[PDB]
Amino acid sequence: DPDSEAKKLLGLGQKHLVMGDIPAAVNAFQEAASLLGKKYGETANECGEAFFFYGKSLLELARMENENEEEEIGNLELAWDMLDLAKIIFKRQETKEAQLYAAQAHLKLGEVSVESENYVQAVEEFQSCLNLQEQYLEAHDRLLAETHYQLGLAYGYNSQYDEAVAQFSKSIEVIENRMAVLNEQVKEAEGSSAEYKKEIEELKELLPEIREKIEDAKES
Amino acid sequence: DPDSEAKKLLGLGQKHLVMGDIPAAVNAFQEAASLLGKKYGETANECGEAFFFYGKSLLELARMENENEEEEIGNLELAWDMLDLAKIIFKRQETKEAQLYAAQAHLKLGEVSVESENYVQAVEEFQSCLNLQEQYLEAHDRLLAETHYQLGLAYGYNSQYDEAVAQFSKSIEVIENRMAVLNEQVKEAEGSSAEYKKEIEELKELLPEIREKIEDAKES
Ligand SMILES: [Ca+2]
Numbered sequence: 119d120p121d122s123e124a125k126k127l128l129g130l131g132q133k134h135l136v137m138g139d140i141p142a143a144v145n146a147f148q149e150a151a152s153l154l155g156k157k158y159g160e161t162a163n164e165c166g167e168a169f170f171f172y173g174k175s176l177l178e179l180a181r182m183e184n185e186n187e188e189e190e191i192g193n194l195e196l197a198w199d200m201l202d203l204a205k206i207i208f209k210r211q212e213t214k215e216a217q218l219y220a221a222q223a224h225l226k227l228g229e230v231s232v233e234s235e236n237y238v239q240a241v242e243e244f245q246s247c248l249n250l251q252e253q254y255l256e257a258h259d260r261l262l263a264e265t266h267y268q269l270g271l272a273y274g275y276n277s278q279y280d281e282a283v284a285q286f287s288k289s290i291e292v293i294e295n296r297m298a299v300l301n302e303q304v305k306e307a308e309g310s311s312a313e314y315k316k317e318i319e320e321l322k323e324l325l326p327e328i329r330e331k332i333e334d335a336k337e338s
Numbered sequence: 339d340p341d342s343e344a345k346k347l348l349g350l351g352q353k354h355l356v357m358g359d360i361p362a363a364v365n366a367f368q369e370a371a372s373l374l375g376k377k378y379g380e381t382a383n384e385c386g387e388a389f390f391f392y393g394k395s396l397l398e399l400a401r402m403e404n405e406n407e408e409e410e411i412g413n414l415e416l417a418w419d420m421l422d423l424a425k426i427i428f429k430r431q432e433t434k435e436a437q438l439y440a441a442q443a444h445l446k447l448g449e450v451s452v453e454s455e456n457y458v459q460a461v462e463e464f465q466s467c468l469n470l471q472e473q474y475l476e477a478h479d480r481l482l483a484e485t486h487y488q489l490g491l492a493y494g495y496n497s498q499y500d501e502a503v504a505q506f507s508k509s510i511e512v513i514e515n516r517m518a519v520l521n522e523q524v525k526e527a528e529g530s531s532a533e534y535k536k537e538i539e540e541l542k543e544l545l546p547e548i549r550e551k552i553e554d555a556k557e558s
């Protein structure tokens with residue numbers, strides 16, 4: 119497709135994320151975002167992912183810079199603009215994957231809000247994320263624990279300490295319930311592994327008897 | 339249901355199978371078979387399982403007895419009669435589970451034929467079983483290996499030694515391919531178990547940081 123030229127940069131940015139080269143991932147994402155936005159418009163489905171990653175990287179790029187104060191300010195305003203576009207694009211689409219992306223955009227909007235000492239807005243954004251996730255995730259999904267934790271943090275920054283304690287406790291509850299589920303999955307996987315190993319041994323000790331029957335049939 | 343009185347004996351027979359008490363399993367199966375046959379007729383779906391198990395047990399009961407020669411003869415003729423009824427009942431029904439039961443009835447008809455020094459008929463029955471199984475089983479199902487092996491045996495008893503070698507080799511091929519598949523399943527199960535254990539450890543080392551944040555929020 120003609121978009122490939124930009125999807126390339128989507129890779130080369132995400133690569134740099136796992137590389138830790140931030141301003142390079144920023145430039146990659148910016149170029150891909152500019153390409154897709156010029157082609158398809160400012161609100162197109164085609165730009166959702168692009169605008170999100172650009173936004174996310176910008177947030178990281180303002181975190182690195184911690185009198186260069188207007189630098190991180192401008193990076194955070196742009197992070198916000200891009201993530202909000204992303205959030206609109208995602209929330210429009212009626213599929214579980216898009217809604218969870220929208221929740222992710224909300225989560226990063228909350229993180230940008232936190233980095234701006236804007237804790238009330240942070241609380242609103244994390245709540246929006248949690249609301250979306252509770253419709254589509256299982257009650258022990260790690261993501262819910264991480265959202266509760268972020269929400270509790272934001273509450274604390276705003277001195278709403280009882281609300282903060284409540285969210286921290288919910289986070290702990292999810293983490294413990296997930297640990298239980300994972301323990302069950304371990305027991306199951308190891309049981310199956312034992313079953314298969316035992317059958318393997320049975321088959322192995324069957325083979326040479328058959329081979330001797332072949333030998334005996336040939337000499338007959 | 340009113341059949342429960344007989345389904346009881348279906349359990350009490352199968353129990354005795356895993357107990358090794360054969361003539362007791364025979365009497366249990368015979369009583370259940372008589373009950374179901376009186377109620378529903380000689381060819382009813384309701385009697386399939388019953389007539390099969392009776393048949394199978396009778397075969398075992400004639401295997402134990404190895405001038406009491408008419409004893410095992412009569413047990414084998416009855417085994418045959420019951421298993422053939424079972425086979426008709428199963429083959430009539432157009433579902434995978436019933437067809438595989440029909441293949442099982444064929445397999446036991448082949449075994450009765452072998453115990454009667456009737457190797458041509460044995461070959462026919464094992465072939466019927468294999469034909470049914472190759473429509474519904476994966477190419478590495480243990481059952482196919484066991485059928486090929488039984489077929490190869492029957493061939494050998496009838497001095498068709500090249501056919502016998504062919505079937506033995508097919509049996510070996512299935513056993514080796516199954517061993518491969520099981521090895522892959524082991525690798526997968528153990529990989530998953532490692533993943534889950536690692537996530538468990540991460541969650542465990544997350545918990546006390548959250549707990550300290552709760553403590554700090556309360557004292558605030
Ligand atoms: Ca603005």
Ligand SMILES: [Ca+2]
Nearest residue numbers: 330331333334
């Ligand atoms: Ca030998």
Ligand SMILES: [Ca+2]
Nearest residue numbers: 415416418419
């Ligand atoms: Ca007869």
Ligand SMILES: [Ca+2]
Nearest residue numbers: 550551553554
């Ligand atoms: Ca402390």
